[PDB]
Design a protein around this ligand. Structure first.
Ligand SMILES: CCCCCCCCCCCCCCCCCC(=O)OC[C@H](COP(=O)([O-])OCC(O)COP(=O)([O-])OC[C@@H](COC(=O)CCCCCCCCCCCCCCCCC)OC(=O)CCCCCCCCCCCCCCCCC)OC(=O)CCCCCCCCCCCCCCCCC
Ligand SMILES: CCCCCCCCCCCCCCCCCC(=O)OCC(COC(=O)CCCCCCCCCCCCCCCCC)OC(=O)CCCCCCCCCCCCCCCCC
Ligand SMILES: CCCCCCCCCCCCCCCCCC(=O)OCC(COC(=O)CCCCCCCCCCCCCCCCC)OC(=O)CCCCCCCCCCCCCCCCC
Ligand SMILES: CCCCCCCCCCCCCCCCCC(=O)OCC(COC(=O)CCCCCCCCCCCCCCCCC)OC(=O)CCCCCCCCCCCCCCCCC
Ligand code: HEA
Ligand code: HEA
Ligand SMILES: CCCCC/C=C\C/C=C\C/C=C\C/C=C\CCCC(=O)O[C@H](COC(=O)CCCCCCCCCCCCCCCCC)COP(=O)(O)OCCN
Ligand SMILES: CCCCCC/C=C\CCCCCCCCCC(=O)O[C@H](COC(=O)CCCCCCCCCCCCCCC)COP(=O)(O)OC[C@@H](O)CO
Ligand SMILES: CCCCCCCCCCO[C@@H]1O[C@H](CO)[C@@H](O[C@H]2O[C@H](CO)[C@@H](O)[C@H](O)[C@H]2O)[C@H](O)[C@H]1O
Ligand SMILES: C[C@H](CCC(=O)O)[C@H]1CC[C@H]2[C@@H]3[C@H](O)C[C@@H]4C[C@H](O)CC[C@]4(C)[C@H]3C[C@H](O)[C@]12C
Ligand SMILES: C[C@H](CCC(=O)O)[C@H]1CC[C@H]2[C@@H]3[C@H](O)C[C@@H]4C[C@H](O)CC[C@]4(C)[C@H]3C[C@H](O)[C@]12C
Ligand SMILES: C[C@H](CCC(=O)O)[C@H]1CC[C@H]2[C@@H]3[C@H](O)C[C@@H]4C[C@H](O)CC[C@]4(C)[C@H]3C[C@H](O)[C@]12C
Ligand code: CUA
Ligand SMILES: [Cu+2]
Ligand SMILES: [Mg+2]
Ligand code: NA
Lengths: 73, 144, 49, 84, 46, 105, 58, 514, 43, 227
């Protein structure tokens, strides 16, 4: 009892591509933020936290008392 | 109807949704009634019956778009057979472990491994992230 | 007319998957393969010296 | 002795345009990058009044007679040393 | 005048599929088996 | 390269050639379906009337199928195009693929 | 010397179905059999030598 | 008639068939050697109890796969069958020399067998570096038999390169310029130029190794003023062009396959594809010392080789993106050859990207001579070459034979192989990052888990290879004869039917100039 | 592509035979060598 | 040393190795992103019935997909080369140690002051002491002072070998007739393991490297006791 509206008929493949390339880019940004957070920054913080108050002599004495060394008993 | 190897240099029929009007009719030879139908096609198509229209279509074309584009159950066969042959591979691995491989070295004995784990912790193997970092040296237990 | 995949696809998929999982699970757990996983959270360290 | 390229059959303008844009100008682009990375000024060296350098047997016919034609004060010392 | 056409432009016969199976089995089987027997040969020297 | 209207008009003119021959009908439709678009009703109309001048009912049905195919998952396009073509379909006695049962697999 | 190329052109274009490596006449066949005998015989001999060298006597 | 046709051939199709048969047989040998590698490594400890034999297996694995499987199949097999047909030529330029390129390969392979049977084998690595490969650490005939095997393979391919370049330059229709020839033809011409220039340098280097071993020269022996590192330069001056030789015909077949099963008349960006292959060919000659970043090289030289190596990603990326752009808008046919080609695009991209990691000489210090390199090149080379070969084989088997494969079986085969090669090689990245050396018969215990998985993967690919043989058997057993092939207007090699007659293009094509 | 029906159809039973023979041709000789490895090394 | 199921690099023992880890993180993120983007685009091209099969103009898009990869390569190359030239920069070692490769073991020479040298062999699996590591321990370790810049000079008295210690980021080939230099600085005491890294024959797998990093005064007394 009613007619159908004219839909978009031209450029449907290009329209699809454009939309999804933009989505792929936005995911790529979002991922890079996650990976810099979950991996690269995590690593920087782990190494900086480890060495911040690290006492290499205390580490050595622990190792020496555990018996691991040929040169130090 | 019947396609011959010796016809390879002639224009041929194909059903392809991107080549909707092939180079030849599907059926070239016409019976008496099919000849009469092609004559009737020269008059108003409103006077053709539904069956006559279908017959004209099936003289020109082999499969309709819906037929040529239909989906199939082939994926079930492919996936299932691939998994069968992957499963068969594990039989070969079982055979190899039983008849080819001997004992692995004594360093994989549970007590060796427990001692080796302590010595790795005593030398602080990977103490920033990889290994000893995961050990709680104050509570003498793996970090929870 | 139904083809091979219509007639047998469901059975091939179901049997192949069931067989594949069963025999890899058996291989992985029942025949003495030493996977050597991480001791972290698994091994109680024991005195060595 | 012919590089690793390989495209004849009747040489022509199309092939030489292809070389121009596909090899020659990319090379220029890459050397231009290389060059405009290793740009930036080096420490100029201590002045030493070596007698085989800053030669003056006759005054130059321009300026005060003691400056070379494309004298650069930052890197070209006079016979008596760098300028103020 | 050589034979032309499917099954004729090859140096092996495909006239009988079971003879063919034997031939292909010897052909690919011999290549796959050879390294195992070379290894055996080297192990049996010393 | 030109405006949509100019493109559609070239294609209408192409199919409207009174003495268009069978080869030209096929070349036209087989070229047209290469483009990123579903042909406007006015193009399809001209192609169907070419079919009529060439006494080829089957190719008219096929052309309606390829309109539906070019729409892909946009299920709204084909019913719209058929709607716009119904006066032509009625005038020329062209049954749709659906009316002929040719949409069954 | 005299140019006898025409004679050779007649000989090698004679419609006798012979391949070019035999089309000179009986001497071609002899040289072909000698070559092929040396190649196949030598190849068998090389396989014998591989057999010998494959095992310890060094 | 049999001997005339198959031992005295001057026919490009029959010689291509000989090459495909030879390469398939070599692939079995190469696969068996690969399974022995992975059996030795599949559990900690020793399996062969003889690491000299282990090293011999590794060495022969590589030589067989490179020189007797990939090059004969891609260049000798697909090149001889397809190149004359794709340019409408009646055969190759030198049809009788072409037959000698083929017949030099069984003797070359025989010499390599001989090397492994005499003494204790050539347990050298396929690089054959001195002094390990010299006459004190490898006394006796094994290494010399290897050198001679390479000499014969080298002559085979140099003469084949001469043949292909001449054929492609000289035997096209007079109207067809080089920019009207198909990409696979381009890919063969460029591969042939690389072979022509690179193999003579290898020949020079291995000849110097032969004379150091037997004539008391000292090219590579410091006692005489020689230098082991000079051999490495000569070897890799060949060996980097070689890895591009191994993939370029693959790129050419991938272009045709992707175009065809996308329903396209042409690949996207044809001149960019030509540019990219030429650029890859040229840059492939100026990067070799990235195989030598740990030998003691000056820092500026490391910086140059790092940078030059990375540039090759730019033309390669143009090819990858143009394959994607060829798919774009396609009427995609999900044929088994298409699956092979799609698997190629992805797995080649992974391996190329780990090659960019390795190009960074600072990181390569830690990754060099580890399984990270083994993982790089079994993605980009082993999977790259095998997937393009399988794609081409499945696609053109009906042309060569007149018969069709069973497509369902071919898709099952693809699926099994794709799981197998990824299970085999993906964990080797972890082994390399964590420091496991390559060319080892056994490993510290920590590395057990990934070696176990990798070896189980190798058996899945074994099952795929067995199934491949059955699938070829089933096709010749059932004899489904080809009828029609679509897209012949843009795939000239199909237009003479399946299989084409012994002589094709006796009357050349008509192409006008306009 | 299109093609004729098989001139010499290979039934499922025939395929099972061809597949079994093919697999055994690869597996039995290698399996024999590997099963006997210790025999070789000990010797 | 590596530990079971390890995915990435060994933890850094030296500042250069720490540099390499951050640079590897940077590069691998790019690798993941490009691989994922290609896989995704593949799937995007393959998931529509919409078609467009007529000729497509290429020159516009080829600009994007040459320039963006060129920018990415430059973003890798800049930190890559910085680390390269850092590693090269002069540091003034306090100690020089030589190592000579041999089939199949390493010898070490510490001849700045006294004639100290010894051989270093793999501990056979049958002689490991409980808790020791199969294929990695040696009888005589390379004792070295921690927190000091050390010049290592590497050569060979027979075939090629290669002296490697992954957690210090070190791999220097051992070439007869050649003396290759590398420098080593451990931030920590402990035991750091490596393995021969150029195929050298039948025991290539079995000639490992163990550095023992201790305070200078312990190194001095050890050195004296090894004369
Ligand atoms: C866009 C970004 C891409 C990613 C880049 C990644 C790296 C970023 C780094 C930062 C070091 C230096 C060193 O580079 C080189 O020297 C190697 C150059 C390789 C060959 C180049 C071919 C040149 C073609 C020119 C076109 C002419 C055509 C000739 C006719 C052909 C037609 C038939 O590298 C370069 O500067 C670039 C070289 C570019 C080409 C040079 C063109 C002229 C060459 C000829 C010189 C010949 C001398 C005559 C001798 C006669 C004896 C026979 C601090 C450390 C320095 C950082 C290194 C930065 C290097 C930058 C790039 C160099 C690598 C590229 C080599 C490409 C060569 C052209 C294809
Ligand atoms: C697709 C993923 C690609 C990623 C690939 C990259 C890497 C390369 C590998 C490249 C490999 C990709 C495999 C994709 C399967 C394609 C299915 C198919 O359409 O095949 C043919 C179809 C026939 O369909 C037709 O008769 C008409 C044409 C086909 C459909 C085209 C429609 C396309 C558009 C529709 C989607 C709309 C979505 C809209 C969305 C848009 C939003 C706007 O029939 C069938 O039953 C299927 C026949 C069997 C095929 C199964 C093969 C599986 C092999 C897997 C390998 C791993 C092994 C795991 C073995 C298991 C054991 C471990
Ligand atoms: C054109 C259509 C097909 C093209 C596409 C498909 C082609 C490929 C797949 C199709 C695959 C189908 C397999 C078909 C089986 C062929 C078997 C055969 O009997 O072939 C024929 C003759 O025999 C017959 O013909 C019998 C039937 C007719 C009589 C016996 C076997 C015994 C074993 C053979 C060696 C002659 O000439 C041809 C020689 C070809 C080159 C073979 C390479 C040999 C490698 C050895 C190298 C040196 C050793 C070093 C060894 C070194 C080790 C380290
Ligand atoms: C890429 C080829 C196909 C791959 C097939 C297998 C799929 C693998 C993943 C499929 C996903 C791909 C990436 C997996 C990385 C997983 C571990 C990791 O994060 O590793 C990071 C580093 C190590 O860094 C560190 O120090 C951090 C360690 C963090 C530890 C946290 C605990 C994690 C639990 C254990 C994980 C078990 C590992 C699985 C074991 C895997 C056994 C097979 O390792 C590495 O560099 C590995 C180097 C790989 C370089 C090649 C790039 C391939 C890209 C594929 C992308 C396509 C999209 C995926 C979609 C792919 C689908 C087609
Ligand atoms: C098919 C064979 C093949 C191919 C094509 C390649 C391609 C490349 N290889 Fe690989 N390579 C080998 C086979 C191959 N390689 C073999 C056999 C060895 C070891 C030999 C031995 O020691 O035995 C090896 C070793 C090797 C090394 C030495 C590692 C070591 O021993 O320490 C290096 C170092 O730079 C290297 C780098 C590269 C690079 C940069 C490419 C580049 O050509 C890759 C370019 C491709 C891409 C980058 C992916 C597609 C690109 C895009 C999608 C664009 C966007 C990407 C970016 C911006 C990065 N290769
Ligand atoms: C085209 C080249 C090619 C191919 C296809 C392969 C295929 C395979 N390779 Fe290959 N491999 C090399 C080239 C190749 N390799 C090279 C050059 C080396 C270095 C040698 C050296 O270090 O000197 C090497 C080294 C190498 C090693 C390292 C050995 C070591 O460092 O000690 C391993 C280990 O897993 C391995 C395994 C495999 C496996 C399991 C397969 C396959 O089984 C995967 C499945 C593929 C098929 C089954 C092919 C089927 C095709 C036709 C039948 N190879
Ligand atoms: C930009 C790229 C280069 C372009 C050319 C630049 C100018 C050169 C003009 C002609 C060159 C020909 C003569 C070369 C003579 C010397 C000029 C050398 C090139 C030059 O320009 O040299 C400059 C000195 O010029 C000076 O003396 C002053 C030079 C001016 C006077 C020249 C007088 C001599 C002319 C003699 C001609 C004889 C010709 C005989 C031909 C006979 C044929 C049979 C270098 O400058 P600088 O500050 O010392 O150092 C730079 C430090 N920052
Ligand atoms: C360690 C010791 C190893 C020893 C290895 C020895 C290996 C091989 C044994 C060689 C036996 C050679 C027999 C003669 C071959 C002559 C080939 C020839 O002359 O080939 C010509 C083509 O190559 C041409 O021209 C130009 C090319 C002519 C090439 C001639 C042969 C070269 C063989 C050695 C090449 C080594 C390359 C060295 C550089 C690295 C003619 O081509 P055809 O197809 O025949 O005919 C075409 C007809 O139209 C002619 O009327
Ligand atoms: C890497 C490629 C190889 C992958 C794995 C191969 C899979 C196994 C295939 C079977 O191989 C057979 O296995 C038998 C054992 O099941 C062996 O018989 C041996 O064992 C029997 C039972 O103990 C005795 O009856 C026999 O005489 C004795 O030869 C037999 O020789 C060997 O052919
Ligand atoms: C016999 C021949 C005459 C030409 C022809 O045959 O008709 C002549 C012409 C050129 C002569 C040759 C040339 O003069 C060059 C050579 C000169 C030497 O002094 C004698 C041999 C030498 C090789 C000559 C031999 C012979 O007398 C030749 C070959
Ligand atoms: C590696 C090779 C020496 C081989 C040998 O030892 O026999 C040498 C010879 C010439 C060298 C090149 C030339 O010296 C020119 C360039 C000098 C730059 O400092 C490094 C890159 C540079 C492009 C060099 C790289 C490399 O060290 C080359 C190519
Ligand atoms: C000029 C040449 C051929 C054009 C033709 O005659 O058809 C084309 C083919 C491939 C082109 C190159 C490739 O498309 C890759 C690069 C793309 C950049 O957008 C410009 C430089 C770039 C390096 C291009 C330069 C030039 O337009 C090339 C070299
Ligand atoms: Cu010493 Cu490997
Ligand atoms: Cu390389
Ligand atoms: Mg090395
Ligand atoms: Na082992």
């Amino acid at each position: 009892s009613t007619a159908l509206a004219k839909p978009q008929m031209r450029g449907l493949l290009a329209r699809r591509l454009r939309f999804h390339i933009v989505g792929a880019f936005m995911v790529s940004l979002g991922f890079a933020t996650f990976y810099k957070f979950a991996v690269a920054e995590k690593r920087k913080k782990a190494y900086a936290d480890f060495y911040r108050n690290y006492d290499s002599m205390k580490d050595f004495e622990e190792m020496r008392k555990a018996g691991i060394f040929q040169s130090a008993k | 109807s019947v396609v011959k190897s010796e016809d390879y240099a002639l224009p041929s029929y194909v059903d392809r949704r991107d080549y909707p009007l092939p180079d030849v009719a599907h059926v070239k030879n016409l019976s008496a009634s099919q000849k009469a139908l092609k004559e009737k096609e020269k008059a108003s198509w409103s006077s053709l019956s539904i069956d006559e229209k279908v017959e004209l279509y099936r003289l020109k074309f082999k499969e309709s778009f819906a037929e040529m584009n239909r989906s199939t159950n082939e994926w079930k066969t492919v996936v299932g057979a691939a998994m069968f042959f992957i499963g068969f591979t594990a039989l070969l691995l079982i055979w190899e472990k039983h008849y080819v491989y001997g004992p692995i070295p004594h360093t994989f004995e549970e007590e060796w491994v427990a001692k080796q784990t302590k010595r790795m912790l005593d030398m602080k193997v990977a103490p920033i992230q990889g290994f000893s970092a995961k050990w709680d040296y104050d509570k003498n237990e793996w970090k929870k | 007319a139904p083809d091979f995949h219509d007639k047998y696809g469901n059975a091939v998929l179901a049997s192949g998957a069931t067989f594949c999982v069963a025999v890899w699970v058996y291989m992985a757990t029942q025949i003495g393969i030493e996977w050597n996983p991480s001791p972290v959270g698994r091994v109680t360290p024991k005195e060595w010296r | 002795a012919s590089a690793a390229k390989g495209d004849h059959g009747g040489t022509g303008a199309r092939t030489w345009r292809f070389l121009t844009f596909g090899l020659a100008l990319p090379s220029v682009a890459l050397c231009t990058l290389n060059s405009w990375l290793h740009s930036g000024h080096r420490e100029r060296p201590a002045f030493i009044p070596y007698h085989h350098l800053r030669i003056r047997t006759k005054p130059f016919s321009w300026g005060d007679g003691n400056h070379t034609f494309f004298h650069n004060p930052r890197v070209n010392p006079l016979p008596t040393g760098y300028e103020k | 005048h050589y034979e032309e056409g499917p099954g004729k432009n090859i140096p092996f016969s495909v006239e009988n599929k079971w003879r063919l199976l034997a031939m292909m089995t010897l052909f690919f089987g011999s290549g796959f088996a050879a390294p195992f027997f070379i290894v055996r040969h080297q192990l049996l020297k010393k | 390269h030109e405006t949509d209207e100019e493109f559609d008009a070239r294609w209408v003119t192409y199919f409207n050639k009174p003495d268009i021959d069978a080869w030209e009908l096929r070349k036209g439709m087989n070229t047209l379906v290469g483009y990123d678009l579903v042909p406007e009703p006015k193009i399809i109309d001209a192609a169907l009337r070419a079919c009529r001048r060439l006494n080829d009912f089957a190719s008219a049905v096929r052309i309606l199928e390829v309109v539906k195919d070019k729409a892909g998952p946009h299920k709204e396009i084909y019913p719209y195009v058929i709607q716009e073509l119904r006066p032509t379909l009625n005038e020329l006695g062209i049954s749709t693929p659906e009316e002929l049962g040719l949409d069954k697999v | 010397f005299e140019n006898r190329v025409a004679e050779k052109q007649k000989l090698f274009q004679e419609d006798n179905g012979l391949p070019v490596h035999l089309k000179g006449g009986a001497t071609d066949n002899i040289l072909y059999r000698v070559t092929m005998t040396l190649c196949l015989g030598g190849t068998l001999y090389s396989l014998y030598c591989l057999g010998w060298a494959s095992f310890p006597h060094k | 008639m049999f001997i005339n046709r198959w031992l005295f051939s001057t026919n490009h199709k029959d010689i291509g068939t000989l090459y495909l048969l030879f390469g398939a047989w070599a692939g079995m040998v190469g696969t068996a050697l690969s399974l022995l590698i992975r059996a030795e490594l599949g559990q900690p400890g020793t399996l062969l109890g003889d690491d000299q034999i282990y090293n011999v297996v590794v060495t022969a694995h590589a030589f067989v796969m490179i020189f007797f499987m990939v090059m004969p199949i891609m260049i000798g097999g697909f090149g001889n069958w397809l190149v004359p047909l794709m340019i409408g030529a009646p055969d190759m330029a030198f049809p009788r020399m072409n037959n000698m390129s083929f017949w030099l390969l069984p003797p070359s392979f025989l010499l390599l067998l001989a090397s492994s049977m005499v003494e204790a084998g050539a347990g050298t690595g396929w690089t054959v570096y001195p002094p390990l490969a010299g006459n004190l650490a490898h006394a006796g005939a094994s290494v010399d038999l290897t050198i001679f095997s390479l000499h014969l393979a080298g002559v085979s391919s140099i003469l084949g390169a001469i043949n292909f370049i001449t054929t492609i330059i000289n035997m096209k229709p007079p109207a067809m310029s080089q920019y009207q020839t198909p990409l696979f033809v381009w890919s063969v011409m460029i591969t042939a130029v690389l072979l022509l220039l690179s193999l003579p340098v290898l020949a020079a280097g291995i000849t110097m190794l032969l004379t150091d071993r037997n004539l008391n020269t000292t090219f590579f022996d410091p006692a005489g003023g020689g230098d082991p590192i000079l051999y490495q330069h000569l070897f890799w001056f060949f060996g980097h062009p070689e890895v591009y030789i191994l993939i370029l015909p693959g790129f050419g077949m991938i272009s045709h396959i992707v175009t065809y099963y996308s329903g396209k008349k042409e690949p996207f960006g044809y001149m960019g594809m030509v540019w990219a292959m030429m650029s890859i060919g040229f840059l492939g000659f100026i990067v070799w010392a990235h195989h030598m970043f740990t030998v003691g090289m000056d820092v500026d030289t490391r910086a140059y080789f790092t940078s030059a190596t990375m540039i090759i990603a730019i033309p390669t990326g143009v090819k990858v993106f143009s394959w994607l752009a060829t798919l774009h808008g396609g009427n995609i046919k999900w044929s088994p050859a298409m699956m092979w080609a799609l698997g190629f695009i992805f797995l080649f991209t992974v391996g190329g990207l780990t090659g960019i990691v390795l190009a960074n000489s600072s990181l390569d210090i830690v990754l060099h001579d580890t399984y990270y390199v083994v993982a790089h090149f079994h993605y980009v080379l082993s999977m790259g070459a095998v997937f393009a070969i399988m794609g081409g084989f499945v696609h053109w088997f009906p042309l060569f034979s007149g018969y069709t494969l069973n497509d369902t079986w071919a898709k099952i085969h693809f699926a099994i192989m794709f799981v197998g090669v990824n299970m085999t090689f993906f964990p080797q990245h972890f082994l390399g990052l964590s420091g496991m050396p390559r060319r080892y018969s056994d490993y510290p215990d920590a590395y057990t888990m990934w070696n176990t998985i990798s070896s189980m993967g190798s058996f899945i690919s074994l099952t795929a290879v067995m199934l491949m043989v059955f699938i070829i058997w089933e096709a010749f057993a059932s004899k489904r004869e080809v009828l029609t092939v679509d897209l012949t207007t843009t795939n000239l090699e199909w237009l003479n039917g399946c299989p084409p007659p012994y002589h094709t293009f006796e009357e050349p094509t008509y192409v006008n100039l306009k | 592509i299109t093609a004729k029906p098989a001139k010499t159809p290979t039934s499922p039973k025939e395929q099972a035979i061809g597949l079994s023979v093919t697999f055994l041709s690869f597996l039995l000789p290698a399996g024999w060598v590997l099963y006997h490895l210790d025999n070789y090394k000990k010797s | 040393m590596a530990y079971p199921m390890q995915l990435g690099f060994q933890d850094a023992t030296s500042p250069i190795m720490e540099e390499l880890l951050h640079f590897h993180d940077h590069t691998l993120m790019i690798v993941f992103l490009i691989s994922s983007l290609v896989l995704y685009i593949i799937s995007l091209m393959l998931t529509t019935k919409l078609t467009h099969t007529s000729t497509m103009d290429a020159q516009e898009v080829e600009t994007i997909w040459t320039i963006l990869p060129a920018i990415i390569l430059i973003l890798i190359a800049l930190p890559s080369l910085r680390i390269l030239y850092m590693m090269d920069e002069i540091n003034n070692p306090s100690l020089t140690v030589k190592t000579m490769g041999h089939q199949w073991y390493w010898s070490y020479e510490y001849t700045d002051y006294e004639d100290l040298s010894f051989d270093s062999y793999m501990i056979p699996t049958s002689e490991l002491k409980p808790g020791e590591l199969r294929l990695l321990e040696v009888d005589n370790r390379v004792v070295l002072p921690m927190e000091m810049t050390i010049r290592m000079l590497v050569s060979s008295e027979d075939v090629l070998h290669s002296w490697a210690v992954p957690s210090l980021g070190l791999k220097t080939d051992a070439i007869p007739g050649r003396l290759n230099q590398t420098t080593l600085m451990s931030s920590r005491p402990g035991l750091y393991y490596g393995q021969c890294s150029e195929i050298c024959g039948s025991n290539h797998s079995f000639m490992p490297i163990v550095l023992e990093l201790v305070p200078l005064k312990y190194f001095e007394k050890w050195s004296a006791s090894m004369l």
